[PDB]
Design an enzyme around this catalytic site. Sequence first.
Site, mmCIF file in Angstrom:
data_model
loop_
_atom_site.group_PDB
_atom_site.id
_atom_site.type_symbol
_atom_site.label_atom_id
_atom_site.label_comp_id
_atom_site.label_asym_id
_atom_site.label_seq_id
_atom_site.Cartn_x
_atom_site.Cartn_y
_atom_site.Cartn_z
ATOM 1 N N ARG A 230 7.909 -2.120 0.523
ATOM 2 C CA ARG A 230 6.643 -1.557 0.950
ATOM 3 C C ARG A 230 6.752 -0.053 1.032
ATOM 4 O O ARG A 230 7.857 0.510 1.052
ATOM 5 C CB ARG A 230 6.242 -2.156 2.313
ATOM 6 C CG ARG A 230 5.859 -3.616 2.219
ATOM 7 C CD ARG A 230 5.850 -4.297 3.583
ATOM 8 N NE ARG A 230 4.768 -3.837 4.432
ATOM 9 C CZ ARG A 230 4.617 -4.220 5.692
ATOM 10 N NH1 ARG A 230 5.471 -5.067 6.213
ATOM 11 N NH2 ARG A 230 3.617 -3.763 6.427
ATOM 12 N N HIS A 231 5.600 0.612 1.088
ATOM 13 C CA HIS A 231 5.558 1.973 1.534
ATOM 14 C C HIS A 231 6.291 2.102 2.855
ATOM 15 O O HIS A 231 6.435 1.171 3.629
ATOM 16 C CB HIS A 231 4.110 2.383 1.871
ATOM 17 C CG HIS A 231 3.444 1.433 2.800
ATOM 18 N ND1 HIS A 231 3.537 1.593 4.193
ATOM 19 C CD2 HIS A 231 2.668 0.253 2.559
ATOM 20 C CE1 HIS A 231 2.828 0.585 4.748
ATOM 21 N NE2 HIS A 231 2.275 -0.286 3.818
ATOM 22 N N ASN A 237 0.165 1.219 10.598
ATOM 23 C CA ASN A 237 1.140 0.210 10.994
ATOM 24 C C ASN A 237 1.468 0.328 12.478
ATOM 25 O O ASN A 237 1.557 -0.686 13.182
ATOM 26 C CB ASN A 237 2.443 0.334 10.196
ATOM 27 C CG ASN A 237 2.308 -0.054 8.723
ATOM 28 O OD1 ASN A 237 3.041 0.462 7.897
ATOM 29 N ND2 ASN A 237 1.391 -0.963 8.398
ATOM 30 N N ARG A 280 -0.021 6.075 1.268
ATOM 31 C CA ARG A 280 1.257 5.700 1.868
ATOM 32 C C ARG A 280 2.308 5.337 0.818
ATOM 33 O O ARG A 280 3.493 5.629 1.011
ATOM 34 C CB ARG A 280 1.056 4.594 2.904
ATOM 35 C CG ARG A 280 0.391 3.329 2.380
ATOM 36 C CD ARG A 280 -0.052 2.554 3.568
ATOM 37 N NE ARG A 280 -0.675 1.250 3.342
ATOM 38 C CZ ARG A 280 -1.974 1.034 3.150
ATOM 39 N NH1 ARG A 280 -2.808 2.040 2.982
ATOM 40 N NH2 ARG A 280 -2.444 -0.212 3.106
ATOM 41 N N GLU A 300 -3.408 -2.492 -1.660
ATOM 42 C CA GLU A 300 -3.289 -3.616 -0.744
ATOM 43 C C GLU A 300 -4.553 -4.473 -0.775
ATOM 44 O O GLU A 300 -5.623 -4.036 -1.195
ATOM 45 C CB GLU A 300 -3.007 -3.117 0.667
ATOM 46 C CG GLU A 300 -2.856 -4.171 1.775
ATOM 47 C CD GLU A 300 -1.773 -5.237 1.552
ATOM 48 O OE1 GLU A 300 -1.637 -5.761 0.420
ATOM 49 O OE2 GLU A 300 -1.065 -5.540 2.550
ATOM 50 N N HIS A 365 2.763 -3.059 -0.755
ATOM 51 C CA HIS A 365 2.130 -3.369 0.505
ATOM 52 C C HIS A 365 2.456 -4.813 0.871
ATOM 53 O O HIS A 365 2.884 -5.609 0.027
ATOM 54 C CB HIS A 365 0.617 -3.244 0.346
ATOM 55 C CG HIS A 365 0.166 -1.901 -0.133
ATOM 56 N ND1 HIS A 365 -0.049 -0.846 0.720
ATOM 57 C CD2 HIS A 365 -0.100 -1.436 -1.376
ATOM 58 C CE1 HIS A 365 -0.447 0.209 0.027
ATOM 59 N NE2 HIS A 365 -0.487 -0.124 -1.247
HETATM 60 O O1 LIG Z 1 -2.499 -11.216 5.290
HETATM 61 P P1 LIG Z 1 -1.894 -10.506 6.477
HETATM 62 O O2 LIG Z 1 -0.762 -11.271 7.114
HETATM 63 O O3 LIG Z 1 -2.979 -10.134 7.458
HETATM 64 O O4 LIG Z 1 -1.193 -9.167 5.886
HETATM 65 C C1 LIG Z 1 -1.968 -8.219 5.163
HETATM 66 C C2 LIG Z 1 -2.138 -6.968 5.987
HETATM 67 O O5 LIG Z 1 -0.864 -6.358 6.134
HETATM 68 C C3 LIG Z 1 -0.970 -4.936 6.057
HETATM 69 O O6 LIG Z 1 -0.318 -4.483 4.840
HETATM 70 C C4 LIG Z 1 -0.175 -4.310 7.207
HETATM 71 O O7 LIG Z 1 -0.765 -4.581 8.456
HETATM 72 C C5 LIG Z 1 -2.474 -4.658 6.060
HETATM 73 O O8 LIG Z 1 -2.837 -3.455 5.417
HETATM 74 C C6 LIG Z 1 -3.037 -5.911 5.398
HETATM 75 O O9 LIG Z 1 -4.403 -6.158 5.661
#
Ligand SMILES: O=P(O)(O)OC[C@H]1O[C@](O)(CO)[C@@H](O)[C@@H]1O
Length: 424
Positions: A230-231, A237, A280, A300, A365
């Site tokens: 990931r970044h 975060n 990021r 993402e 991401h």
């Molecule tokens: O599907 P999950 O578990 O919510 O993970 C995706 C999420 O994780 C992230 O990369 C980090 O919180 C968000 O930008 C994204 O919406």
Amino acid sequence: KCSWASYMTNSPTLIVMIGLPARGKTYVSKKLTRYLNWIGVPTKVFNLGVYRRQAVKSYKSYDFFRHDNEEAMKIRKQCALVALKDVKAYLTEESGQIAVFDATNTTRERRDLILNFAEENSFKVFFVESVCDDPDVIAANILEVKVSSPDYPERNRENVMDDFLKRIECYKVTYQPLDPDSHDKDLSFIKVINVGQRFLVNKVQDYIQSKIVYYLMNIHVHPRTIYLCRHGESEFNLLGKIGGDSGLSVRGKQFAQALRKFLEEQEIADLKVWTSQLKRTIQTAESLGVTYEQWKILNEIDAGVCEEMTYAEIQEQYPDEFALRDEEKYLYRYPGGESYQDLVQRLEPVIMELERQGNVLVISHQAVMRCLLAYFLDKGADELPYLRCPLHTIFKLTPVAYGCKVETIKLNVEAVNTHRDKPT
Ligand SMILES: O=P(O)(O)OC[C@H]1O[C@](O)(CO)[C@@H](O)[C@@H]1O
Ligand SMILES: Nc1ncnc2c1ncn2[C@@H]1O[C@H](COP(=O)(O)OP(=O)(O)O)[C@@H](O)[C@H]1O
């Protein structure tokens, strides 16, 4: 509920492998099945070698593969009939859509048996024939996967090589390759020639066959490494906010510097670096001192109306939707945004270019990286949205034997946890 590719699949299909031993049929069978499942088409491999070893449970010599060994031919044909009955059950009782029949299938007679079976059940048939007569390739293949295979006990590669080349000779006696000019002019197939240098494609019937052809024409067997991370940790975060376009925290910048040193220490030849268009990932790559490519389709997952919210805020404002997502995390689509199923479709060109390329590092991401890892590691839709992809950890993927090894490398920079388990 089905993926786009599965929506475009109608009658069930039998993919029938053809070729002499040690031509990559099992390798291709497994890899094609992993890809088809990942794009959402339920597919299963039927490895006739497994059936036969289960039936015979002994270390047979090349003698077993002689076309005039009547008792062995009887056993081998019985194994094929049993496997075809399993194919029929998969495609008619178990909701399978594609069965990959991994056997030599080197005679017109055996292929007619399969074609007649398919016609009895209204299955489509597409053949994949692997042709290679380079003895250096065959020897390498034998040493790579046949010398330490269940067909043989502990014994030196020299003796195993001898037996396996004699086995190949047995099949050459009766091998009838597909002939598009006459006997096979109306069959649907691809010949993969000289390990993907050359192809002959005949009578592609439908969407899924067109996709299979494109996939098989763009994979290779050259050793390389894929790195996924990931970044570096972002401002959002640290706040538990999803989506957005926030920058690195100072600790994410430390990770980017640690990643530079990691690459400066590995001296990976000709490493390509890909990022998304979100700041990021760009800022992470900027610290590395390398040229890199930004891909909009690596951005993402789109959370739609939930962008920039915390999970607590989403549950409070959208309690029914939040509960639905926990129940069906792969298929649930954020309003104004994406599901993981959509994200897999969006990432298919990434997968294809990863297959075409050599050493690649992808800086992306959490959700994107789950999708990519699920492809390489053959993880299904129930598991994919829950794979653990921590910040500041590199996943090193090495194509190995018939699959892919994964090593996790945690760099020495702390980060917040962004992984939310499925409740209870
Ligand atoms: O599907 P999950 O578990 O919510 O993970 C995706 C999420 O994780 C992230 O990369 C980090 O919180 C968000 O930008 C994204 O919406
Ligand atoms: N199109 C191909 N042609 C020749 N060899 C291939 C091909 N694709 C993959 N391979 C090599 O084939 C080896 C695996 O052979 P395998 O799948 O077990 O052969 P088979 O099932 O035909 O006996 C691997 O070394 C792999 O690199």
